[PDB]
mmCIF file of all heavy atoms in Angstrom:
data_model
loop_
_atom_site.group_PDB
_atom_site.id
_atom_site.type_symbol
_atom_site.label_atom_id
_atom_site.label_comp_id
_atom_site.label_asym_id
_atom_site.label_seq_id
_atom_site.Cartn_x
_atom_site.Cartn_y
_atom_site.Cartn_z
ATOM 1 N N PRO A 1 -26.759 -5.978 -6.441
ATOM 2 C CA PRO A 1 -27.660 -5.217 -5.555
ATOM 3 C C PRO A 1 -28.717 -6.193 -4.952
ATOM 4 O O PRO A 1 -28.928 -7.272 -5.367
ATOM 5 C CB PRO A 1 -28.307 -4.224 -6.433
ATOM 6 C CG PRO A 1 -28.205 -4.723 -7.821
ATOM 7 C CD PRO A 1 -26.862 -5.519 -7.841
ATOM 8 N N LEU A 2 -29.297 -5.623 -3.834
ATOM 9 C CA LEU A 2 -30.227 -6.412 -3.046
ATOM 10 C C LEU A 2 -31.503 -6.761 -3.847
ATOM 11 O O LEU A 2 -32.168 -7.782 -3.562
ATOM 12 C CB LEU A 2 -30.626 -5.695 -1.772
ATOM 13 C CG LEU A 2 -30.118 -6.392 -0.523
ATOM 14 C CD1 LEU A 2 -30.370 -5.523 0.666
ATOM 15 C CD2 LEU A 2 -30.768 -7.796 -0.319
ATOM 16 N N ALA A 3 -31.905 -5.928 -4.823
ATOM 17 C CA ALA A 3 -33.076 -6.157 -5.626
ATOM 18 C C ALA A 3 -32.867 -7.140 -6.737
ATOM 19 O O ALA A 3 -33.741 -7.420 -7.539
ATOM 20 C CB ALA A 3 -33.550 -4.826 -6.162
ATOM 21 N N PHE A 4 -31.698 -7.674 -6.890
ATOM 22 C CA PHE A 4 -31.383 -8.595 -7.992
ATOM 23 C C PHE A 4 -32.188 -9.914 -7.919
ATOM 24 O O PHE A 4 -32.306 -10.400 -6.780
ATOM 25 C CB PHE A 4 -29.844 -8.905 -8.026
ATOM 26 C CG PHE A 4 -29.365 -9.389 -9.353
ATOM 27 C CD1 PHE A 4 -29.035 -8.510 -10.354
ATOM 28 C CD2 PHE A 4 -29.176 -10.711 -9.612
ATOM 29 C CE1 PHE A 4 -28.544 -8.900 -11.536
ATOM 30 C CE2 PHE A 4 -28.667 -11.167 -10.821
ATOM 31 C CZ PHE A 4 -28.393 -10.260 -11.821
ATOM 32 N N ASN A 5 -32.789 -10.286 -9.010
ATOM 33 C CA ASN A 5 -33.575 -11.574 -8.993
ATOM 34 C C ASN A 5 -33.160 -12.336 -10.278
ATOM 35 O O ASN A 5 -33.422 -11.763 -11.382
ATOM 36 C CB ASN A 5 -35.070 -11.257 -9.066
ATOM 37 C CG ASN A 5 -35.925 -12.419 -8.765
ATOM 38 O OD1 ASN A 5 -36.024 -13.347 -9.669
ATOM 39 N ND2 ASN A 5 -36.506 -12.531 -7.620
ATOM 40 N N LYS A 6 -32.537 -13.459 -10.167
ATOM 41 C CA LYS A 6 -32.009 -14.149 -11.272
ATOM 42 C C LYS A 6 -33.158 -14.563 -12.247
ATOM 43 O O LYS A 6 -32.891 -14.654 -13.434
ATOM 44 C CB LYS A 6 -31.233 -15.355 -10.847
ATOM 45 C CG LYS A 6 -29.795 -14.967 -10.328
ATOM 46 C CD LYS A 6 -28.882 -16.127 -10.337
ATOM 47 C CE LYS A 6 -28.916 -16.843 -11.647
ATOM 48 N NZ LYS A 6 -27.844 -16.267 -12.640
ATOM 49 N N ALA A 7 -34.273 -14.999 -11.714
ATOM 50 C CA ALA A 7 -35.384 -15.369 -12.571
ATOM 51 C C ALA A 7 -35.880 -14.304 -13.502
ATOM 52 O O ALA A 7 -36.165 -14.489 -14.610
ATOM 53 C CB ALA A 7 -36.483 -15.920 -11.673
ATOM 54 N N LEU A 8 -35.980 -13.033 -12.979
ATOM 55 C CA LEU A 8 -36.448 -11.972 -13.732
ATOM 56 C C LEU A 8 -35.329 -11.496 -14.736
ATOM 57 O O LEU A 8 -35.672 -11.012 -15.792
ATOM 58 C CB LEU A 8 -36.887 -10.813 -12.912
ATOM 59 C CG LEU A 8 -38.139 -11.054 -12.065
ATOM 60 C CD1 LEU A 8 -38.384 -9.897 -11.054
ATOM 61 C CD2 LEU A 8 -39.367 -11.274 -12.906
ATOM 62 N N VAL A 9 -34.112 -11.503 -14.258
ATOM 63 C CA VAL A 9 -32.924 -11.146 -15.185
ATOM 64 C C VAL A 9 -32.918 -12.072 -16.382
ATOM 65 O O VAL A 9 -32.735 -11.668 -17.522
ATOM 66 C CB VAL A 9 -31.641 -11.146 -14.392
ATOM 67 C CG1 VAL A 9 -30.500 -10.944 -15.338
ATOM 68 C CG2 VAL A 9 -31.670 -9.996 -13.358
ATOM 69 N N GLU A 10 -33.088 -13.340 -16.103
ATOM 70 C CA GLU A 10 -32.982 -14.345 -17.199
ATOM 71 C C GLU A 10 -34.154 -14.064 -18.243
ATOM 72 O O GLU A 10 -33.929 -14.095 -19.500
ATOM 73 C CB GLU A 10 -33.120 -15.748 -16.668
ATOM 74 C CG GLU A 10 -31.782 -16.295 -16.198
ATOM 75 C CD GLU A 10 -30.635 -16.054 -17.221
ATOM 76 O OE1 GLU A 10 -30.862 -16.235 -18.438
ATOM 77 O OE2 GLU A 10 -29.500 -15.693 -16.742
ATOM 78 N N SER A 11 -35.375 -13.755 -17.755
ATOM 79 C CA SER A 11 -36.486 -13.445 -18.658
ATOM 80 C C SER A 11 -36.202 -12.192 -19.432
ATOM 81 O O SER A 11 -36.553 -12.180 -20.643
ATOM 82 C CB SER A 11 -37.760 -13.322 -17.831
ATOM 83 O OG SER A 11 -38.858 -13.250 -18.717
ATOM 84 N N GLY A 12 -35.678 -11.195 -18.800
ATOM 85 C CA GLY A 12 -35.311 -9.952 -19.566
ATOM 86 C C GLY A 12 -34.299 -10.182 -20.594
ATOM 87 O O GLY A 12 -34.346 -9.543 -21.702
ATOM 88 N N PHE A 13 -33.279 -10.967 -20.363
ATOM 89 C CA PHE A 13 -32.210 -11.195 -21.297
ATOM 90 C C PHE A 13 -32.746 -11.889 -22.557
ATOM 91 O O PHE A 13 -32.367 -11.469 -23.702
ATOM 92 C CB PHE A 13 -31.134 -12.090 -20.694
ATOM 93 C CG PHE A 13 -29.815 -12.043 -21.462
ATOM 94 C CD1 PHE A 13 -28.880 -11.110 -21.218
ATOM 95 C CD2 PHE A 13 -29.625 -13.050 -22.401
ATOM 96 C CE1 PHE A 13 -27.683 -11.109 -21.898
ATOM 97 C CE2 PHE A 13 -28.378 -13.015 -23.096
ATOM 98 C CZ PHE A 13 -27.452 -12.041 -22.848
ATOM 99 N N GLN A 14 -33.711 -12.837 -22.437
ATOM 100 C CA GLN A 14 -34.292 -13.481 -23.575
ATOM 101 C C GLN A 14 -35.146 -12.476 -24.277
ATOM 102 O O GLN A 14 -35.240 -12.494 -25.544
ATOM 103 C CB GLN A 14 -35.040 -14.706 -23.115
ATOM 104 C CG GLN A 14 -34.154 -15.740 -22.511
ATOM 105 C CD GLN A 14 -33.212 -16.412 -23.426
ATOM 106 O OE1 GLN A 14 -33.550 -16.695 -24.540
ATOM 107 N NE2 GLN A 14 -31.958 -16.535 -23.001
ATOM 108 N N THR A 15 -35.887 -11.601 -23.583
ATOM 109 C CA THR A 15 -36.811 -10.692 -24.202
ATOM 110 C C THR A 15 -36.046 -9.597 -24.971
ATOM 111 O O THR A 15 -36.421 -9.250 -26.065
ATOM 112 C CB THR A 15 -37.643 -9.983 -23.085
ATOM 113 O OG1 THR A 15 -38.329 -10.969 -22.304
ATOM 114 C CG2 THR A 15 -38.672 -9.070 -23.696
ATOM 115 N N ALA A 16 -34.878 -9.118 -24.434
ATOM 116 C CA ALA A 16 -34.107 -8.110 -25.075
ATOM 117 C C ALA A 16 -33.518 -8.621 -26.416
ATOM 118 O O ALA A 16 -33.524 -7.901 -27.379
ATOM 119 C CB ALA A 16 -32.973 -7.637 -24.148
ATOM 120 N N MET A 17 -33.041 -9.901 -26.454
ATOM 121 C CA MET A 17 -32.543 -10.412 -27.695
ATOM 122 C C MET A 17 -33.690 -10.449 -28.792
ATOM 123 O O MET A 17 -33.393 -10.176 -29.935
ATOM 124 C CB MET A 17 -31.930 -11.759 -27.471
ATOM 125 C CG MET A 17 -30.507 -11.759 -27.117
ATOM 126 S SD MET A 17 -29.615 -13.279 -27.508
ATOM 127 C CE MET A 17 -30.512 -14.473 -26.518
ATOM 128 N N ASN A 18 -34.848 -10.902 -28.388
ATOM 129 C CA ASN A 18 -35.873 -11.041 -29.385
ATOM 130 C C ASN A 18 -36.432 -9.647 -29.874
ATOM 131 O O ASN A 18 -36.872 -9.554 -31.019
ATOM 132 C CB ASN A 18 -37.075 -11.825 -28.815
ATOM 133 C CG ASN A 18 -36.691 -13.237 -28.387
ATOM 134 O OD1 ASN A 18 -35.505 -13.559 -28.503
ATOM 135 N ND2 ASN A 18 -37.608 -14.037 -27.978
ATOM 136 N N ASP A 19 -36.307 -8.639 -28.962
ATOM 137 C CA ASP A 19 -36.710 -7.333 -29.438
ATOM 138 C C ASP A 19 -35.640 -6.610 -30.218
ATOM 139 O O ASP A 19 -35.887 -5.516 -30.714
ATOM 140 C CB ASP A 19 -37.083 -6.483 -28.226
ATOM 141 C CG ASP A 19 -38.388 -6.860 -27.583
ATOM 142 O OD1 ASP A 19 -39.365 -7.013 -28.328
ATOM 143 O OD2 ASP A 19 -38.405 -7.121 -26.358
ATOM 144 N N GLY A 20 -34.487 -7.188 -30.350
ATOM 145 C CA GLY A 20 -33.403 -6.536 -31.152
ATOM 146 C C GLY A 20 -32.543 -5.511 -30.439
ATOM 147 O O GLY A 20 -31.792 -4.824 -31.059
ATOM 148 N N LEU A 21 -32.613 -5.476 -29.120
ATOM 149 C CA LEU A 21 -31.804 -4.476 -28.367
ATOM 150 C C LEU A 21 -30.354 -4.837 -28.415
ATOM 151 O O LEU A 21 -29.518 -3.888 -28.150
ATOM 152 C CB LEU A 21 -32.316 -4.434 -26.906
ATOM 153 C CG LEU A 21 -33.740 -4.028 -26.706
ATOM 154 C CD1 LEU A 21 -33.939 -3.547 -25.248
ATOM 155 C CD2 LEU A 21 -34.136 -2.897 -27.660
ATOM 156 N N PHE A 22 -29.930 -6.063 -28.618
ATOM 157 C CA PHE A 22 -28.527 -6.540 -28.624
ATOM 158 C C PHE A 22 -28.018 -6.679 -30.049
ATOM 159 O O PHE A 22 -26.867 -7.226 -30.200
ATOM 160 C CB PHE A 22 -28.395 -7.842 -27.848
ATOM 161 C CG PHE A 22 -28.685 -7.670 -26.334
ATOM 162 C CD1 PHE A 22 -29.000 -8.843 -25.659
ATOM 163 C CD2 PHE A 22 -28.572 -6.485 -25.800
ATOM 164 C CE1 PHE A 22 -29.202 -8.720 -24.289
ATOM 165 C CE2 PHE A 22 -28.914 -6.370 -24.410
ATOM 166 C CZ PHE A 22 -29.180 -7.536 -23.708
ATOM 167 N N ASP A 23 -28.710 -6.236 -31.074
ATOM 168 C CA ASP A 23 -28.323 -6.432 -32.491
ATOM 169 C C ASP A 23 -27.410 -5.226 -32.922
ATOM 170 O O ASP A 23 -27.849 -4.294 -33.556
ATOM 171 C CB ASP A 23 -29.530 -6.558 -33.295
ATOM 172 C CG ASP A 23 -30.218 -7.883 -33.162
ATOM 173 O OD1 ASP A 23 -29.846 -8.690 -32.313
ATOM 174 O OD2 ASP A 23 -31.245 -8.072 -33.859
ATOM 175 N N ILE A 24 -26.157 -5.412 -32.607
ATOM 176 C CA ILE A 24 -25.095 -4.458 -32.956
ATOM 177 C C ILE A 24 -24.041 -5.158 -33.674
ATOM 178 O O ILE A 24 -23.829 -6.392 -33.446
ATOM 179 C CB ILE A 24 -24.546 -3.611 -31.764
ATOM 180 C CG1 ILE A 24 -25.724 -3.390 -30.765
ATOM 181 C CG2 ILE A 24 -24.005 -2.244 -32.193
ATOM 182 C CD1 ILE A 24 -25.169 -3.034 -29.375
ATOM 183 N N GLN A 25 -23.246 -4.530 -34.462
ATOM 184 C CA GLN A 25 -22.130 -5.048 -35.201
ATOM 185 C C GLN A 25 -20.980 -5.439 -34.282
ATOM 186 O O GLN A 25 -20.695 -4.730 -33.312
ATOM 187 C CB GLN A 25 -21.648 -4.139 -36.291
ATOM 188 C CG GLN A 25 -22.499 -4.134 -37.590
ATOM 189 C CD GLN A 25 -21.689 -4.498 -38.850
ATOM 190 O OE1 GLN A 25 -20.471 -4.737 -38.739
ATOM 191 N NE2 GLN A 25 -22.456 -4.585 -39.950
ATOM 192 N N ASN A 26 -20.320 -6.566 -34.575
ATOM 193 C CA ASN A 26 -19.117 -6.946 -33.860
ATOM 194 C C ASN A 26 -19.378 -7.281 -32.437
ATOM 195 O O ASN A 26 -18.677 -6.761 -31.526
ATOM 196 C CB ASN A 26 -17.972 -5.958 -34.063
ATOM 197 C CG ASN A 26 -17.294 -6.044 -35.392
ATOM 198 O OD1 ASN A 26 -16.443 -6.962 -35.618
ATOM 199 N ND2 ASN A 26 -17.631 -5.223 -36.338
ATOM 200 N N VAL A 27 -20.390 -8.040 -32.130
ATOM 201 C CA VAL A 27 -20.704 -8.503 -30.798
ATOM 202 C C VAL A 27 -20.976 -10.078 -30.749
ATOM 203 O O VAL A 27 -21.133 -10.667 -31.787
ATOM 204 C CB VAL A 27 -21.971 -7.775 -30.235
ATOM 205 C CG1 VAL A 27 -21.882 -6.274 -30.423
ATOM 206 C CG2 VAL A 27 -23.254 -8.323 -30.861
ATOM 207 N N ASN A 28 -20.862 -10.598 -29.583
ATOM 208 C CA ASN A 28 -21.075 -11.979 -29.380
ATOM 209 C C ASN A 28 -22.430 -12.243 -28.669
ATOM 210 O O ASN A 28 -22.828 -11.473 -27.828
ATOM 211 C CB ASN A 28 -19.950 -12.592 -28.499
ATOM 212 C CG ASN A 28 -19.256 -13.679 -29.232
ATOM 213 O OD1 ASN A 28 -19.593 -14.104 -30.325
ATOM 214 N ND2 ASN A 28 -18.155 -14.231 -28.625
ATOM 215 N N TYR A 29 -22.995 -13.356 -28.967
ATOM 216 C CA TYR A 29 -24.336 -13.671 -28.424
ATOM 217 C C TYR A 29 -24.247 -14.926 -27.518
ATOM 218 O O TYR A 29 -23.453 -15.822 -27.900
ATOM 219 C CB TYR A 29 -25.373 -13.935 -29.536
ATOM 220 C CG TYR A 29 -25.499 -12.706 -30.374
ATOM 221 C CD1 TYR A 29 -25.003 -12.570 -31.682
ATOM 222 C CD2 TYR A 29 -26.327 -11.614 -29.929
ATOM 223 C CE1 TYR A 29 -25.209 -11.513 -32.405
ATOM 224 C CE2 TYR A 29 -26.455 -10.478 -30.742
ATOM 225 C CZ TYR A 29 -25.939 -10.421 -31.982
ATOM 226 O OH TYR A 29 -26.119 -9.340 -32.768
ATOM 227 N N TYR A 30 -24.992 -14.914 -26.457
ATOM 228 C CA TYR A 30 -24.935 -15.965 -25.421
ATOM 229 C C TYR A 30 -26.329 -16.503 -25.164
ATOM 230 O O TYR A 30 -27.386 -15.842 -25.421
ATOM 231 C CB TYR A 30 -24.340 -15.425 -24.160
ATOM 232 C CG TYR A 30 -23.039 -14.676 -24.324
ATOM 233 C CD1 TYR A 30 -23.086 -13.336 -24.590
ATOM 234 C CD2 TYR A 30 -21.840 -15.330 -24.239
ATOM 235 C CE1 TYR A 30 -21.904 -12.597 -24.757
ATOM 236 C CE2 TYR A 30 -20.643 -14.580 -24.371
ATOM 237 C CZ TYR A 30 -20.662 -13.249 -24.652
ATOM 238 O OH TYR A 30 -19.522 -12.607 -24.806
ATOM 239 N N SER A 31 -26.390 -17.760 -24.688
ATOM 240 C CA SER A 31 -27.648 -18.418 -24.422
ATOM 241 C C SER A 31 -28.371 -17.862 -23.146
ATOM 242 O O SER A 31 -29.632 -17.909 -23.025
ATOM 243 C CB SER A 31 -27.411 -19.920 -24.239
ATOM 244 O OG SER A 31 -26.738 -20.518 -25.366
ATOM 245 N N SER A 32 -27.618 -17.288 -22.227
ATOM 246 C CA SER A 32 -28.174 -16.755 -21.052
ATOM 247 C C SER A 32 -27.289 -15.701 -20.429
ATOM 248 O O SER A 32 -26.116 -15.590 -20.807
ATOM 249 C CB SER A 32 -28.455 -17.912 -20.035
ATOM 250 O OG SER A 32 -27.233 -18.184 -19.267
ATOM 251 N N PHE A 33 -27.891 -14.906 -19.527
ATOM 252 C CA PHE A 33 -27.144 -13.905 -18.766
ATOM 253 C C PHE A 33 -26.069 -14.531 -17.916
ATOM 254 O O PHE A 33 -25.112 -13.843 -17.600
ATOM 255 C CB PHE A 33 -28.061 -12.994 -17.977
ATOM 256 C CG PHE A 33 -27.438 -11.933 -17.181
ATOM 257 C CD1 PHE A 33 -27.011 -10.793 -17.779
ATOM 258 C CD2 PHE A 33 -27.123 -12.157 -15.811
ATOM 259 C CE1 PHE A 33 -26.382 -9.770 -17.058
ATOM 260 C CE2 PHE A 33 -26.501 -11.145 -15.081
ATOM 261 C CZ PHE A 33 -26.078 -9.972 -15.686
ATOM 262 N N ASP A 34 -26.273 -15.802 -17.520
ATOM 263 C CA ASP A 34 -25.249 -16.506 -16.774
ATOM 264 C C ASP A 34 -23.933 -16.634 -17.632
ATOM 265 O O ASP A 34 -22.852 -16.393 -17.116
ATOM 266 C CB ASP A 34 -25.753 -17.942 -16.387
ATOM 267 C CG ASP A 34 -25.107 -18.463 -15.161
ATOM 268 O OD1 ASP A 34 -24.302 -17.777 -14.558
ATOM 269 O OD2 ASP A 34 -25.421 -19.579 -14.767
ATOM 270 N N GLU A 35 -24.071 -17.022 -18.852
ATOM 271 C CA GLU A 35 -22.893 -17.133 -19.756
ATOM 272 C C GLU A 35 -22.303 -15.750 -20.031
ATOM 273 O O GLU A 35 -21.050 -15.630 -20.153
ATOM 274 C CB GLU A 35 -23.276 -17.896 -21.002
ATOM 275 C CG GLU A 35 -23.868 -19.262 -20.865
ATOM 276 C CD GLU A 35 -24.254 -19.861 -22.099
ATOM 277 O OE1 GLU A 35 -23.999 -19.335 -23.170
ATOM 278 O OE2 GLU A 35 -24.964 -20.949 -22.127
ATOM 279 N N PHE A 36 -23.144 -14.743 -20.181
ATOM 280 C CA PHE A 36 -22.673 -13.435 -20.490
ATOM 281 C C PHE A 36 -21.803 -12.942 -19.432
ATOM 282 O O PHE A 36 -20.636 -12.377 -19.760
ATOM 283 C CB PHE A 36 -23.838 -12.539 -20.782
ATOM 284 C CG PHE A 36 -23.413 -11.091 -20.963
ATOM 285 C CD1 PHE A 36 -22.872 -10.682 -22.124
ATOM 286 C CD2 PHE A 36 -23.657 -10.162 -19.989
ATOM 287 C CE1 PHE A 36 -22.526 -9.288 -22.348
ATOM 288 C CE2 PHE A 36 -23.321 -8.864 -20.111
ATOM 289 C CZ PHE A 36 -22.701 -8.428 -21.289
ATOM 290 N N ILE A 37 -22.160 -13.005 -18.190
ATOM 291 C CA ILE A 37 -21.412 -12.372 -17.060
ATOM 292 C C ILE A 37 -20.133 -13.176 -16.762
ATOM 293 O O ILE A 37 -19.080 -12.562 -16.454
ATOM 294 C CB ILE A 37 -22.316 -12.202 -15.803
ATOM 295 C CG1 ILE A 37 -21.665 -11.253 -14.810
ATOM 296 C CG2 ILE A 37 -22.564 -13.597 -15.192
ATOM 297 C CD1 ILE A 37 -22.615 -10.712 -13.826
ATOM 298 N N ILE A 38 -20.176 -14.465 -16.931
ATOM 299 C CA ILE A 38 -18.963 -15.318 -16.625
ATOM 300 C C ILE A 38 -17.961 -15.066 -17.774
ATOM 301 O O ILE A 38 -16.712 -15.009 -17.480
ATOM 302 C CB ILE A 38 -19.341 -16.770 -16.461
ATOM 303 C CG1 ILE A 38 -20.257 -16.944 -15.229
ATOM 304 C CG2 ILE A 38 -18.150 -17.639 -16.330
ATOM 305 C CD1 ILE A 38 -19.632 -16.345 -13.956
ATOM 306 N N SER A 39 -18.352 -15.030 -18.961
ATOM 307 C CA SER A 39 -17.500 -14.806 -20.141
ATOM 308 C C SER A 39 -16.718 -13.502 -19.992
ATOM 309 O O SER A 39 -15.524 -13.460 -20.249
ATOM 310 C CB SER A 39 -18.199 -14.943 -21.484
ATOM 311 O OG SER A 39 -17.332 -14.979 -22.557
ATOM 312 N N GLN A 40 -17.429 -12.418 -19.634
ATOM 313 C CA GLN A 40 -16.833 -11.193 -19.510
ATOM 314 C C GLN A 40 -15.883 -11.099 -18.303
ATOM 315 O O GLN A 40 -14.857 -10.416 -18.365
ATOM 316 C CB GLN A 40 -17.875 -10.013 -19.402
ATOM 317 C CG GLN A 40 -18.815 -9.940 -20.511
ATOM 318 C CD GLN A 40 -18.199 -9.229 -21.734
ATOM 319 O OE1 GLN A 40 -17.115 -8.762 -21.663
ATOM 320 N NE2 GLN A 40 -18.958 -9.121 -22.798
ATOM 321 N N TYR A 41 -16.213 -11.878 -17.301
ATOM 322 C CA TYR A 41 -15.287 -12.010 -16.138
ATOM 323 C C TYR A 41 -13.950 -12.591 -16.514
ATOM 324 O O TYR A 41 -12.904 -12.177 -16.025
ATOM 325 C CB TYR A 41 -15.980 -12.824 -15.033
ATOM 326 C CG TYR A 41 -15.524 -12.463 -13.612
ATOM 327 C CD1 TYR A 41 -16.577 -11.989 -12.753
ATOM 328 C CD2 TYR A 41 -14.299 -12.539 -13.143
ATOM 329 C CE1 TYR A 41 -16.188 -11.549 -11.500
ATOM 330 C CE2 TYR A 41 -13.977 -12.168 -11.848
ATOM 331 C CZ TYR A 41 -14.863 -11.680 -11.053
ATOM 332 O OH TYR A 41 -14.560 -11.355 -9.730
#
């Protein structure tokens, strides 16, 4: 979308991991949202 901002997305990805939003069983963890989107692709 037009409102996408990579700088803010990257900050949110790091924030979400530290807050525990991604802590679910049987998942993989990535260093950045760049790696996450490409790996799923």
Side-chain angles (χ1 to χ4, degrees):
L2 248 174
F4 204 80
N5 190 292
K6 284 199 50 89
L8 295 172
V9 171
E10 277 314 318
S11 189
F13 197 86
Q14 300 291 318
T15 308
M17 271 205 298
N18 298 4
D19 286 310
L21 299 199
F22 294 161
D23 287 3
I24 325 160
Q25 280 240 356
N26 281 281
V27 310
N28 240 356
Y29 299 104
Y30 311 86
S31 305
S32 82
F33 181 81
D34 209 1
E35 301 177 9
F36 173 76
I37 196 161
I38 297 305
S39 190
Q40 302 283 359
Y41 211 116

